[PDB]
Design a protein around this ligand. Structure first.
Ligand SMILES: C=CCNc1nc(N)c(C(=O)c2ccccc2)s1
Length: 294
């Protein structure tokens, strides 16, 4: 825009392009997301309102929404680094447990807040978890599938990451819940600990089968109603559940217990963000400051 001067192209988001920009008048530095359409939704612009009214230390602030010239611009407070970059930069030594614990605890606070206000993220991944020099971590780039809804990928040519998708989404459930965000965060928690993605699928079925090979193929016993799901096939191979201690070594029992509750197959058995906050794993949580190279 004319009121904003592009500094750098931050990346090609899920809906559009993201730039680091400066408000040519206020001098404020922000993250600007540009969105593509001929009709322009309504339930969306109102769904965006819910997002703008969200105020929480662990949620990126949506400062302004500008609809002009068939383009939709979302102005967000700017953070200097994302968790994917931080994990890559920490791959040799790993992120220290106290910081992993702090980040998980803060993200659960953010989700607990979103969820109590009936807001779902839907697409948590390391790339949209932003961190600052003060030791905070915040949820960014909320899905809003209850608006445009992810069709194929994006609007040009970009491979959508399926690594953090909950099983119920992969099995075709149209009405998923807040539980989908807990699953994604559990996958991220595992990744921070082991320094390797938990379920790195390269297709929907491979994603589903990588989950099955690790947690066991779900059945009516562990997930009532699973065989009646839209894309469930009786022909799915039957894999036995692997021993959990092989999953995230050398994470302690408190951490493994919490992770297991975040990865329950049944969305109704999966722990809530609020209940997770009370888990024994956080008894000694603190707020360390990360070493960030900007
Ligand atoms: C991580 C480096 C860029 N700094 C960013 N700050 C904010 N606030 C961002 C976002 O809000 C964002 C938007 C779409 C996709 C990913 C992140 S990115």
């Amino acid at each position: 825009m004319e009121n904003f001067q592009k500094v750098e192209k931050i990346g090609e988001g899920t809906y559009g392009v993201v730039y680091k920009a400066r408000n040519k008048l206020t001098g404020e530095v922000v993250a600007l997301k540009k969105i593509r359409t001929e009709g322009v939704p309504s339930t969306a612009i109102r769904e965006i309102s819910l997002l703008k009214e969200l105020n929480h230390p662990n949620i990126v602030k949506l400062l302004d929404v500008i609809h002009t010239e068939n383009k939709l611009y979302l102005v967000f407070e700017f953070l200097h680094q994302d968790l994917k970059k931080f994990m890559d930069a920490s791959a040799l030594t790993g992120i220290p447990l106290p910081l992993i614990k702090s980040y998980l605890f803060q993200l659960l606070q953010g989700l607990a807040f979103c969820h109590s206000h009936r807001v779902l993220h839907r697409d948590l991944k390391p790339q949209n978890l932003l961190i600052n020099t003060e030791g905070a971590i915040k949820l960014a780039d909320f899905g809003l599938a209850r608006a445009f809804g992810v069709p194929v990928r994006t609007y040009t040519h970009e491979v959508v990451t399926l690594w953090y998708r909950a099983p119920e989404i992969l099995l075709g459930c149209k009405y998923y819940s807040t539980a989908v965000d807990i699953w994604s965060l559990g996958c991220i928690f595992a990744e921070m600990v082991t320094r390797r993605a938990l379920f790195p699928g390269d297709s929907e079925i491979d994603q589903l089968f990588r989950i099955f090979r690790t947690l066991g193929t779900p059945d009516e016993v562990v997930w009532p109603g699973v065989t009646s799901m839209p894309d469930y096939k009786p022909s799915f191979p039957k894999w036995a559940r692997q021993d959990f201690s092989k999953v995230v070594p050398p994470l302690d029992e408190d951490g493994r217990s919490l992770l297991s509750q975040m990865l329950h197959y049944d969305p109704n058995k999966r722990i809530s963000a609020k209940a997770a906050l009370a888990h024994p794993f956080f008894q000694d949580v603190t707020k360390p400051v990360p070493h960030l190279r900007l």
